[PDB]
Amino acid sequence: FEGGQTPLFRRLPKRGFTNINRKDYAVVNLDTLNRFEDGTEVTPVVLKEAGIVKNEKAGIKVLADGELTKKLTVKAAKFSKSAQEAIEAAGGSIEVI
Amino acid sequence: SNGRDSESKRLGAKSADGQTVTGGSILYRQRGTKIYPGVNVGIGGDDTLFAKVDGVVRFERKGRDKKQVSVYPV
């Protein structure tokens, strides 16, 4: 309250809306997966059992920030293109649940 | 009646002689060109002087009785 002066919230405009059908995915940034033994199969079940991902919000999305150093048969809901490149270049294999 | 006036606008110099300054800075606000532009200096719609590149501000007499601003870089 600014003393009757027009408050900051009131002098500004509302913006946007919310999409009820929004898909918010749980993020795995490619530096985690250096954990797992090469050749194995990464899944949301594996990630949850390890404790990496506790909230599979809408599905796992994989993103490429860190450097990958393994072969991995990774699978998820969606991959980013840089992650596809990095995995397939290391020698893994992308799938989609 | 007489009781009214406008917001005083903060004219006059804003950068000093011998002062290094960034490009795009402001050197002298004014209404009417009480000081002219010079080297590496422009002039706005409101006759305000601004340095186009870095350098030290230098004010100079433009001959007898008119003044100049200049910005010589390093």
Binding site: L8, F9, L12, P13 | -
Partner: protein
């Protein structure tokens, strides 16, 4: 009872990564013939909430 979130702020700001707040601008609704185009294009660009204002509204939009 837990805090109540100021919904009029929740509709008018957004958290960034440093915790700061994004905001729409004012002078951007209905009266544009009185404003130059530099103002219009510079006001369709969002800005950030002030230091002293965040000091005043953070308790309201604490978590949001």
């Amino acid at each position: 009872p837990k805090q109540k979130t100021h919904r009029g702020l929740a509709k008018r700001v957004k958290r960034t990564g440093g915790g700061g707040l994004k905001r729409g601008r004012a002078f951007t609704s209905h009266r544009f013939h009185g404003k130059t185009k530099k103002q219009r294009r510079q006001l369709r660009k969002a800005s950030m909430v002030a230091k002293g204002d965040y000091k005043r509204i953070r308790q309201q939009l604490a978590r949001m």
